[PDB]
């Protein structure tokens, strides 16, 4: 019910020229959760390149930081009021800071830092949980074993 | 009271230790702590046993009451089974 109201707003992010940073995944998920489905490629081609550009550019600027997520792109984009060379620079800045937070919480790139960050929209808590959950899995499995 | 990173050792009936960090609030109850672990890691509250500040932690007790206060404070989680 609260998820419907979020779906509505998420879906509203593509009306005829709604200045905003729609992320194809979010909308795609809002519909799955709702009960239908719309091709993901079709959403990509309907939306501008803007946010992917921001992401590609950030990846170009430091390949040591792995792939950037749409949510991280949008974040920097909004923060820089649509200014695109400024979004790249802040997008990289924000991601760097995060990679060493995970590092200093015991997860560097060699341990999946980068993929979890991408996969969770640059959200550290959620990356961390995911990462800790992969390693706690044997324990989870043992709860049901013997 | 605001967010605290908590250094947790996790063990079970048999295994090896593992250590994880959790985000908590000193005014959180143990019941709430357990619910959070359930939700993220899938460990039923009923199979969770906690020791915090060198004392077993009960459901209605706050982390605060076990002296939790700063980043890097520690806690101990032991897991029962089936």
CATH of the domain at A87: 1.10.8.10
Dig out the tokens for B51 from the structure. 């020791």
CB B4 within 8 A of CB B26: yes
A30 shares its domain with A79: no
Q: Tell me how close the Cα of B50 comes to any Cα of chain A, in angstroms.
A: 16
Q: What's the CA dihedral at A85, A87, A93, A99 to 10 degrees?
A: -130
Reported resolution, Å? 2.7
Of A133, A138, A146, the CB nearest to B40: A133
B41 → closest Cβ in A125, A140, A145: A140
Q: How far apart are CA A84 and CA A91, in angstroms?
A: 10
- Please check whether residues A41 and A62 belong to one and the same domain: no
Q: Tokens representing A95?
A: 């991601």
My answer on whether A141 and A125 are in the same domain is yes
A13 and A38 together in one domain: yes
Residues A52 and A104 in one domain: yes
**Domains in chain B, CATH or no CATH each:** 1-82 (3.10.20.90)
Q: How far apart are CA A111 and CA A99, in angstroms?
A: 11
A contacts of B18 (beta carbons < 8 Å): 135-136, 139
Q: Are residues A99 and A115 in the same domain?
A: no
Query: Across-strand partners of B22?
Result: B6
Say what the alpha-carbon torsion angle B2, B5, B9, B12 is, to the nearest 10 degrees. 60
Report the alpha-carbon distance of residue A91 to residue A72 in Å, rounded: 7
Region of A122 (left: φ > 0; alpha: ψ -120 to 50; beta: rest) is: left
| CA of B41 vs chain A CAs: smallest distance (Å) | 6
Question: Virtual CA dihedral for B17, B19, B22, B28, nearest 10 degrees?
Answer: 40
Q: How far apart are CA A55 and CA A48, in angstroms?
A: 13
Secondary structure (3-state) at A106: coil
Q: Looking at residue A6, which CATH number applies to its domain?
A: 6.10.140.1100
C-alpha span between B56 and B52 (Å, rounded):
6
Q: A57 and A77, same structural domain?
A: yes
CA atoms within 13 A on the CB side of A88: 13
In terms of CA atoms, which chain A residue is nearest residue B77?
Answer: A139
Q: What is the DSSP string of A23-50?
A: -HHHHHHHHHHHT----HHHHHHHS-SH
Nearest one of A72, A118, A67, A65 to A91, comparing CA atoms: A72
- Alpha-carbon torsion angle B9, B39, A122, A110, nearest 10: 40
The answer to whether B23 and A128 are in contact (CB under 8 A) is: no
Assess whether A87 and A56 both reside in one domain: yes
Does A126 lie in the same domain as A116? Answer: yes
Q: How many structural domains is chain A composed of?
A: 3
Q: Are residues A126 and A141 in the same domain?
A: yes
Which residues touch A63 (CB under 8 Å, ≥6 apart)? none
Tell me A112's DSSP state: T
Q: Does the distance separating the beta carbons of A105 and B82 come in below 8 Å? A: no
Token pair 């079970």 is found at: B12
Residue A143: how many other CB atoms lie within 10 Å: 17
Question: A16: which 2 tokens?
Answer: 């005829």
| SS3 label, residue A142 | helix
Distance of CA A133 to the CA centre of its chain: 19
Give the separation between CA A120 and CA A68, rounded to whole angstroms: 10
Q: What chain A residue is nearest to B80 in terms of C-alpha separation?
A: A143
Looking at chain B, the residues that come just before a C–N gap of over 2.5 A are none
Q: Are B21 and B9 in contact (CB under 8 A)?
A: no
- Residues A26, A2 within the same domain: yes
Distance CA B69, CA B57 (A): 15
Lateral strand order in the sheet of B4-12: B18-24, B4-12, B74-79, B48-52, B55-56
Q: B79 and A139 in contact by Cβ < 8 A?
A: yes
Q: Could you list the residue range(s) of the whole structural domain that residue A114 is in?
A: 109-146
**A77 and A54 in one domain?**
yes
- The rounded distance, in Å, linking the Cα atoms of A26 and A97 is 25
């Amino acid at each position: 019910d609260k998820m419907r109201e979020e779906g509505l707003q998420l879906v509203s992010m593509i009306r005829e020229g709604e200045a905003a940073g729609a992320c194809p995944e979010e909308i795609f998920s809002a519909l799955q959760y709702s009960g239908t489905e719309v091709p993901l490629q079709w959403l990509r081609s309907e939306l501008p390149y803007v946010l992917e550009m921001v992401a590609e550019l950030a990846g170009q600027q430091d390949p040591g930081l792995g792939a950037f997520s749409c949510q991280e792109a949008r974040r920097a984009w909004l923060d820089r009021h649509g200014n695109l060379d400024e979004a790249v620079e802040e997008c990289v800045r924000t991601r760097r800071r995060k990679v060493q937070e995970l590092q200093s919480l015991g997860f560097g790139p060699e341990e999946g830092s980068l993929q979890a960050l991408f996969q969770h929209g640059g959200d550290v808590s959620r990356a961390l949980t995911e990462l800790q959950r992969q390693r706690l899995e044997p324990f989870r499995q043992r709860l049901w074993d013997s | 009271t605001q967010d605290i990173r908590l250094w947790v050792s996790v063990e079970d009936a048999q295994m090896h230790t593992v250590t994880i960090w959790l985000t908590v609030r000193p005014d959180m109850t143990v019941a709430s702590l357990k619910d959070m672990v359930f939700l993220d890691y899938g460990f039923p509250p009923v199979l969770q046993q906690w020791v915090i500040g060198q004392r077993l932690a009960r459901d209605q007790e706050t982390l605060h009451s076990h002296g939790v206060r700063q980043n890097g404070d520690s806690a101990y989680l032991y897991l029962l089974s089936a």
